[PDB]
């Protein structure tokens, strides 16, 4: 409900160093392909960061409704970006409960 947003601008972007920072599986890119991200140039790139449950990762797609995509974080239907999600059970969970 309070997702951050970082402006990435006035820099050269290497998208092959993304895989060395987080242990995800693959990109989920809409409009583009993740292997052609180094051969083309943008104007502004935004990065939104939040933590959700594994049931609700499918609601981070354009055209989806539900609980996250209704009152928490809604994507436009003309989305031209990539969604990266990975599991984190060793940093976001506690035996007493992370609240």
């Amino acid at each position: 409900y309070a997702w951050n947003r970082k402006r990435i601008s006035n820099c050269v972007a290497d998208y092959s160093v993304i895989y060395n920072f987080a242990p995800f599986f693959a990109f989920k890119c809409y409009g583009v392909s993740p292997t052609k991200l180094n051969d083309l140039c943008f104007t502004n790139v935004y990065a939104d960061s939040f933590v959700i449950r594994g049931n609700e990762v499918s609601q981070i797609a354009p055209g989806q409704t539900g609980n996250i995509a209704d009152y928490n974080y809604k994507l436009p239907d003309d989305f031209t970006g990539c969604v990266i999600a990975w599991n984190s059970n060793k940093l976001d969970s506690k035996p007493s409960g992370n609240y």
Partner: protein
């Protein structure tokens, strides 16, 4: 073993199938049937159905 699921090792086996241009040598467990001629019949020649 302490790395995440994206940095864990994976074993990959890739099978590439060479289609019918040469005489076939890798064929499945289906049995054969005696040949009939001069009769309207469904045939199956090495996977070619007609």
């Amino acid at each position: 073993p302490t790395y995440g699921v994206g940095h864990q090792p994976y074993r990959v086996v890739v099978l590439s199938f060479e289609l019918l241009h040469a005489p076939a040598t890798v064929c499945g467990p289906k049995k054969s049937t005696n040949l009939v001629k001069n009769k309207c019949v469904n045939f199956n020649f090495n996977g070619l159905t007609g």
